[PDB]
């Protein structure tokens, strides 16, 4: 079969009366969760998955856009024009979301342990819905996601292309606290060791190195995320200071931000979060280093955030 682009329907576990935002929107845009979506599995079959070429990423992106624009109302927007708007302080709390396929179609799910994101997959299964996914609009670090069951996995449509970003799913979940931020230094060091293991297994044993990113807008240079509806910006220089072969990160809150929704800058009003680290976005610096190879944090593209969740799923048509 060939996958087809259709309009999936999101299935949430949300509640209407509750004040929270994602619940309010998901109430009228999504549906309740099926108690169980029959996981019809197939053994002696394989199919070609390309996480970097999946319409589900696009649709999810448009849904999150519709949520932000419909729910979280920025004070002011500058996108080649001007607009004045109210700024109600909202309750922002990502909840698990499913994406189910209508009748006549199904969702092929790659259940192979290690999968480099692209190429055919064995042990394929068929489902009507998707696992619990939380639309986390984070950068640099992926939060409240789904970590890889076994070991670590790194993915990129092309490792030898330094512009193309690199997605990472960890062996374990790392606790990060914010309110400034804190994080166990040791567990972080360990996860770094594992990443060095995979990377070294990727680039002919060349010595691996970590270092913070250079230049870019305050959104990209710093770990930007949301907390109760307020935009947090954190300095992750303490997490990238060593080279291989507890930590407290300072943060600010300036409402002048560059909308990920569109190439423009929107602002909010002054004000009036503990999570997991389930993935990492990185970029490689090619350069000319004979042995050293430096990887720095980056992001800014949310389709990369969704692809970290929708890499094994893909639509399909049937009778």
């Amino acid at each position, epitope marked *: 079969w060939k996958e087809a682009n259709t309009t999936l329907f999101c299935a949430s576990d949300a509640k209407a009366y509750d004040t929270e935002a994602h619940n309010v929107w998901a109430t009228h845009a999504c549906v309740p969760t099926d108690p169980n979506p029959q996981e019809v599995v197939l053994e002696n079959v394989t199919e070609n998955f390309n996480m970097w070429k999946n319409h589900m990423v696009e649709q999810m992106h448009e849904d999150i856009i519709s949520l932000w624009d419909q729910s979280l109302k920025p004070c002011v927007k500058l996108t080649g024009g001007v607009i004045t708007q109210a700024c109600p302080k909202i309750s922002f709390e990502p909840i698990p979301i499913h994406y189910c396929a209508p009748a006549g179609f199904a969702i092929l799910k790659c259940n192979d342990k290690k999968f480099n994101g692209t190429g055919p997959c064995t042990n394929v299964s068929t489902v009507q819905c998707t696992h619990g996914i939380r639309p986390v609009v984070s950068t640099q670090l992926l939060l409240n996601g789904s970590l890889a069951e076994e070991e670590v996995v790194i993915r990129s449509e092309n490792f030898t292309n330094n512009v193309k970003n690199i997605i990472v799913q960890l062996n374990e979940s790392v606790q990060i606290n914010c309110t400034h931020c804190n994080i166990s230094r040791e567990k972080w060091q360990n996860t770094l060791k594992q990443i060095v293991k995979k990377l070294r297994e990727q680039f002919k044993n060349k010595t691996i190195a970590f270092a913070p990113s250079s230049g870019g807008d305050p959104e990209i240079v710093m770990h930007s995320f949301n907390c109760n509806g307020e935009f947090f910006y954190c300095n992750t220089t303490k997490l990238f200071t060593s080279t291989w072969n507890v930590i407290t990160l300072p943060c600010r809150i300036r409402q002048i931000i560059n909308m990920w929704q569109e190439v423009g800058k929107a602002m909010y009003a002054p004000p009036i979060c503990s999570s997991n680290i389930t993935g990492l976005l990185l970029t490689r610096d*090619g350069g*000319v*280093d004979t042995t050293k190879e430096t990887f720095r944090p980056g992001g800014g593209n949310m389709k990369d955030n969704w692809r970290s969740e929708l890499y094994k799923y893909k639509v399909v048509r049937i009778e």
Partner: antibody
Amino acid sequence: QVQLVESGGGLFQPGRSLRLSCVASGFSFNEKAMHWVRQAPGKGLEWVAIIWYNSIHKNYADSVKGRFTISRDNSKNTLYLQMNSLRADDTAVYYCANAGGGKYDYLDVWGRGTTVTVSS
Amino acid sequence: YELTQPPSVSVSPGQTARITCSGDTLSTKWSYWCQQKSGQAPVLVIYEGNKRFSGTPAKFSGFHSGTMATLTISGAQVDDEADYYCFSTDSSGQTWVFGGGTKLTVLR
């Protein structure tokens, strides 16, 4: 196949300013960094500038620092090099080359530059 | 900082020509070779020391070692005569620099 053309070269009396352009085609311009290089008549090549695909970074030789400003535009696949104060020694052929990648990478393909002459 | 390479390399036809390139930054940085024929734009020949971009003549080899990268040309011919340049970066990796240029010429 790659193609790089340069423009803006000519004769200009010293002290003036100038802008050189470089149109590209045949490769993912948006995913590559670009280098400006210079070569005086019958002399060795001299590196001028580099700029990243995203333009966030860019560096000049210590020779032309403070006068040259490198720019680009992916929506037009065009590279730019502005020269504020023209010196006699700035007379040379100006080549526009692409990068192996998009962040501080070797100079792969060269496009036949454009001659800039500075004379009083 | 500086990349020093011989100015001239005389060659009787058929012999194996060799050009050097010495720079303290070559210890931790690659060397990239380049060729420019008379009245023509320069052209890449060898990148990151050994590696070659097929399909260019295999007679162009690159031996990067220590602080010296050697461009070797097996069986030089009248066509090969040209001005070659080894280029690299400084210790920082932010700036690029070319060698002085080496003139490969057949002995007439």
